[PDB]
Curated annotation (Swiss-Prot):
This is Bifunctional 3'-5' exonuclease/ATP-dependent helicase WRN. Residues 238-388 form the Helicase C-terminal domain. The gene is WRN. GO terms for biological process: base-excision repair; cellular response to gamma radiation; cellular response to starvation; cellular senescence; determination of adult lifespan; DNA damage response; DNA geometric change; DNA metabolic process. Phosphorylated by PRKDC.
Length: 430
């Protein structure tokens, strides 16, 4: 019988990934993991490990889609991956699942060494699970495996356990600081369910990670309300609905970021809000380091209510009480949009994310993309613009579209009490 009915009339897996997984990467994913496609975050982590050997901190709310990020890379290159974890029963479960998928894998510890260690040294295992206690006393073994086989990655699960400041400190994690000393060229993928910026900083310091890629996925973010609205042809007409008059000035409900495509538009929008004596500042790459760091400082100190910025603004901010994100103009693509709205309401309190768009917007202009001479990049950019256009045009649940694109199916299936309600999105309200 038919297992799915996903195909739609007038629509034509790899599309929204840059660069695209190659044919053998997809064959490997189907053969060894029983999946047809990578989710964007899975590909971000996997590609960063394989092609850049880049350290990662991957915050993942649950195990749903998590294991692929550290299991896939060593399976594809046919070398070895190390998984460091204190979760013995889960490690045993994953080892058995790997064996049943015809991936040679084992649990290495003192009591298991007689059975598996010689075979690990001879490169017979793709994936080896070890405790931090065992790992701490065997840096010499890891150096031998790096020399004779090549370690694709070291995964550190429950990575928050390295922080004295967290709620689950393990003495056993302290010595994992030595991994980067012993193995400076082996990328570490640190995994945790804690989205705390403070704990992330502790993990990066304690594991000596170098410019790590930070991702945060597996969350349904029920406190983010999503709306797409047409521009009215006037900045003040467009932004007046967001404003409240108090004393002899206008303000937003709370701390607000307005993302504009152009530097010109950030100055144009700032100018209009300044006329209302609204507490705000501009942020783009055309400003100096001094001015940019001051805008950041004043926003964190709540000395400005609103930052009117290009998408240069965001990565540096850990601010938990962003009440409103406005995309003033169509966003660059759904990837950029997801990164930008993800910064809203990190305190878990009610926030709103509005796109104000026109069919005329620069990020919907095909002319700029047709000028791209590289065929693969041109077609990718056109596919991303089309996907962004489809989101803006949709009458379907905005949350369902974003979760379907970016998250494991479980985030939709585990999402209870927001989708279809008045607080979900404009399309669920109406
Ligand atoms: O929002 C998420 C996940 N998420 C993401 C982020 C984040 O901070 N948080 N925080 C929480 N919370 C989980 C629950 O507890 C509070 C924190 N969840 C996320 C960032 C982390 C990287 N980043 C940075 O600037 C950054 N930072 C530090 C260092 C380097 C960096 O590059 C951008 C924001 O990435 C995007 C994903 N999913 C999500 C779910 C539903 C929807 C909606 F259906 F409603 F549309 C939309 C989205 Cl986007
Ligand atoms: Zn909805």
């Amino acid at each position: 019988e038919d297992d799915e009915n996903e195909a739609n009339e007038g629509e034509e897996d790899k599309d929204f990934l840059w660069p695209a997984p190659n044919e053998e990467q997809v064959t490997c994913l189907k053969m060894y993991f029983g999946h047809s496609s990578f989710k964007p975050v899975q590909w971000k982590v996997i590609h960063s490990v394989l092609e850049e050997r880049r350290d990662n901190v991957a915050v993942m709310a649950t195990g749903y889609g998590k294991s692929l990020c550290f299991q896939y890379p060593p399976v594809y290159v046919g070398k070895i991956g190390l998984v460091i974890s204190p979760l013995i029963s889960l490690m045993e479960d994953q080892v058995l699942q790997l064996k049943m998928s015809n991936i040679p894998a084992c649990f290495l510890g003192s009591a298991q060494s007689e059975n598996v260690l010689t075979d690990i040294k001879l490169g017979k295992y793709r994936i080896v699970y070890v405790t931090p206690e065992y790992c701490s006393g065997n840096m010499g073994l890891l150096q031998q495996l790096e020399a004779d086989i090549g370690i694709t990655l070291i995964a550190v699960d429950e990575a928050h356990c390295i922080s004295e400041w967290g709620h689950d400190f393990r003495d056993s994690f302290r010595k994992l600081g030595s991994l980067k000393t012993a193995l400076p060229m082996v990328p570490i993928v640190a995994l945790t369910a804690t989205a705390s910026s403070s704990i992330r900083e502790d993990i990066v310091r304690c594991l000596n990670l170098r410019n790590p890629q930070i991702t945060c996925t597996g969350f349904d973010r029920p406190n983010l309300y999503l709306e797409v609205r047409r521009k009215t042809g006037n900045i003040l007409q467009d932004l007046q609905p967001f404003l409240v008059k108090t004393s002899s000035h206008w303000e937003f409900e709370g701390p607000t970021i307005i993302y504009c495509p152009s530097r010109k538009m950030t100055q144009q929008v700032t100018g209009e809000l300044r006329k209302l004596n609204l507490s705000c500042g501009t942020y783009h790459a055309g400003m100096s380091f001094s001015t940019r760091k001051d805008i950041h400082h004043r926003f964190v100190r709540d000395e400005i209510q609103c930052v009117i910025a290009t998408i240069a603004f965001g990565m540096g901010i850990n601010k938990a009480d962003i009440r409103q994100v406005i995309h003033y103009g169509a966003p660059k693509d759904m990837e950029s949009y997801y990164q930008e709205i993800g910064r809203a309401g990190r305190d878990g309190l009610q926030s709103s994310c509005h796109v104000l768009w026109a069919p005329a917007d620069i990020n919907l202009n095909r002319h700029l993309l047709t000028e791209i001479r590289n065929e693969k990049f041109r077609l990718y950019k056109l596919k991303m613009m089309a996907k962004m256009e489809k989101y803006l045009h949709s009458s379907r649940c905005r949350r369902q579209i974003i979760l379907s694109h970016f998250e494991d199916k479980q985030v939709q299936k585990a999402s209870l009490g927001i989708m279809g309600t008045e607080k979900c999105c404009d399309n669920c309200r109406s």
